[PDB]
Amino acid sequence: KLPPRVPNLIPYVGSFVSFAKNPVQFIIDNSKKYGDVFTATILGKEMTFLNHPKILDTFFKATDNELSLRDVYRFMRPVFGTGVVYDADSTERMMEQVKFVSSGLTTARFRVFVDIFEDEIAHKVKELGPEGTVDVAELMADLIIFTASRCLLGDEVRQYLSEKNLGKLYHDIDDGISPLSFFYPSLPAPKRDKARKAVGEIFQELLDKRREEHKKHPERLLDESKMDVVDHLLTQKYKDGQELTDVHRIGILIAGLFAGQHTSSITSSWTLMNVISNKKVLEKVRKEQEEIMGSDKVLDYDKVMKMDYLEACMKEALRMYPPLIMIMRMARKPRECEQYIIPKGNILVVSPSVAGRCTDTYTNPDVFDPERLTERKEHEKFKYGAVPFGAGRHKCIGENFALLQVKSIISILLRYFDMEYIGKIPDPSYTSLVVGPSPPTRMRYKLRKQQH
Numbered sequence: 001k002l003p004p005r006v007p008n009l010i011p012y013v014g015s016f017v018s019f020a021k022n023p024v025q026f027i028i029d030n031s032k033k034y035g036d037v038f039t040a041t042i043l044g045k046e047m048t049f050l051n052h053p054k055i056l057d058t059f060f061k062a063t064d065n066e067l068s069l070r071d072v073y074r075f076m077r078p079v080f081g082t083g084v085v086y087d088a089d090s091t092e093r094m095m096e097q098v099k100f101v102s103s104g105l106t107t108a109r110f111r112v113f114v115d116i117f118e119d120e121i122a123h124k125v126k127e128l129g130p131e132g133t134v135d136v137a138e139l140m141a142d143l144i145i146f147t148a149s150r151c152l153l154g155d156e157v158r159q160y161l162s163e164k165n166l167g168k169l170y171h172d173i174d175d176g177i178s179p180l181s182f183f184y185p186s187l188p189a190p191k192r193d194k195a196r197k198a199v200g201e202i203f204q205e206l207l208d209k210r211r212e213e214h215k216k217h218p219e220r221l222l223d224e225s226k227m228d229v230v231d232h233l234l235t236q237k238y239k240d241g242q243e244l245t246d247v248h249r250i251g252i253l254i255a256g257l258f259a260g261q262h263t264s265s266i267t268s269s270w271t272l273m274n275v276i277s278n279k280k281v282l283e284k285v286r287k288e289q290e291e292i293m294g295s296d297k298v299l300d301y302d303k304v305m306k307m308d309y310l311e312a313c314m315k316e317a318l319r320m321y322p323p324l325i326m327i328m329r330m331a332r333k334p335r336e337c338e339q340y341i342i343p344k345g346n347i348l349v350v351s352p353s354v355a356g357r358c359t360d361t362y363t364n365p366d367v368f369d370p371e372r373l374t375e376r377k378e379h380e381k382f383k384y385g386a387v388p389f390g391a392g393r394h395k396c397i398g399e400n401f402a403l404l405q406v407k408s409i410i411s412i413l414l415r416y417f418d419m420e421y422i423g424k425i426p427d428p429s430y431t432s433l434v435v436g437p438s439p440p441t442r443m444r445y446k447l448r449k450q451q452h
């Protein structure tokens with residue numbers, strides 16, 4: 001009836017230790033010991049892991065009073081704000097908040113986003129000079145921070161950003177949300193709260209200034225390719241006619257940037273590293289760039305939509321190194337899985353890291369090989385063989401923007417620079433909420449066209 005258990009080391013703490021050591025290695029080991037479904041006690045919580053592509057229907061198809069996101073991720077409240085996202089008054093209200101973000105991620109906006117990528121990267125190359133070495137992860141994090149800001153918030157953020165360490169403030173927020181806050185939501189984190197407050201006042205300022213700009217220049221609000229997420233948030237109410245508060249607006253913005261800061265920057269690092277460490281892969285990538293760019297000197301949205309191989313590379317970095325290593329739901333109702341019934345109160349857990357290495361779906365899963373997808377279609381086997389962006393009702397609404405931003409960044413960097421990585425491809429580091437490459441991650445670079 002109930003699934004098999006992992007025996008607890010001691011009571012209460014249960015399997016925390018080996019889980020904490022390497023949450024991914026933990027799930028593979030015990031999936032062998034106990035099958036496709038098993039439960040473990042981890043710092044007081046019943047956690048049921050579903051580890052086979054074939055059984056993921058139970059997870060992804062449910063509704064939000066069968067399987068709740070809000071019962072598990074509410075602990076993000078200090079970062080996102082009161083009444084926002086998983087602390088929204090209702091599921092329905094959370095969905096509306098999400099649609100405000102997605103409403104600023106239209107085709108029309110995507111055309112302008114590509115220009116933004118070119119601009120930020122052009123400022124960045126001045127700063128890098130014609131040759132050098134650089135930390136890849138830091139570089140990606142900066143480029144993604146400055147470009148997502150401008151994409152979601154409008155260009156008028158940009159001086160504030162340079163001139164008030166927004167990069168740093170996000171580092172301090174991000175460097176005060178431990179995975180252990182899942183288990184103890186009260187773990188005080190005073191630097192985090194300090195940062196968050198600070199970012200809030202800045203976004204307050206920006207919202208006030210945008211209101212004066214909408215006084216004078218309302219024609220802007222008719223133009224599709226000028227409407228950023230800040231604009232949608234000032235001019236839209238909820239479906240039932242209730243107005244949004246500035247606290248909600250700020251919280252949604254912060255969540256929006258947070259979403260696609262770290263995941264997109266990590267994914268661009270893994271992608272770029274594997275691409276330049278493999279001659280074959282880099283040949284095909286460069287070949288594609290050259291076909292698509294022809295005689296044009298800059299990128300645009302149609303060009304990036306043609307980069308199928310670069311995309312496959314990105315997808316392959318997401319199979320091998322997904323930055324959200326675990327996805328979770330709370331059972332508000334007992335729930336059927338295979339021959340078992342997972343009871344109310346259990347947390348269901350699926351891991352895209354475990355899925356990405358399943359020999360049942362992928363041959364030679366430790367090899368970075370974009371051709372497993374483009375040619376062999378290996379992903380297509382099971383319906384849920386590939387879940388880097390999720391599935392069903394809470395699929396990532398940021399996917400197309402992410403793909404757009406990573407592909408653009410890597411394509412532009414390839415255009416400017418020959419690059420070589422230093423050392424072996426690292427392993428993932430399980431020391432934070434969003435999992436990224438273990439430092440050091442460095443690379444040599446050289447400008448492909450010069451003036452000295």
Ligand code: HEM
Nearest residue numbers: 256259260263264267327388389390394395396397398402
């Ligand atoms: C490579 C980059 C990214 C990856 C790998 C990624 C991955 C994911 C995954 C796996 C989920 C499913 C979460 C779950 O089922 O519990 C998800 C959901 C989501 N992602 Fe992303 N994401 C990325 C970028 C973005 C960006 C840039 C944004 C926003 C600007 C975004 C916004 C969201 C939102 C709002 C959801 C919630 C969907 C819902 O509950 O309706 N993501 N993402």
Ligand SMILES: O=C(O[C@H](Cn1ccnc1)c1ccc(Cl)cc1Cl)c1cccc(C(F)(F)F)c1
Nearest residue numbers: 073076085098101252255256258259260263396
């Ligand atoms: O940032 C977001 O979620 C990320 C996980 N993530 C990153 C990319 N895709 C998902 C997340 C969720 C829960 C926890 Cl405990 C930890 C993290 Cl890092 C997110 C989720 C819903 C809505 C929104 C927004 F308001 F902006 F629309 C943003």
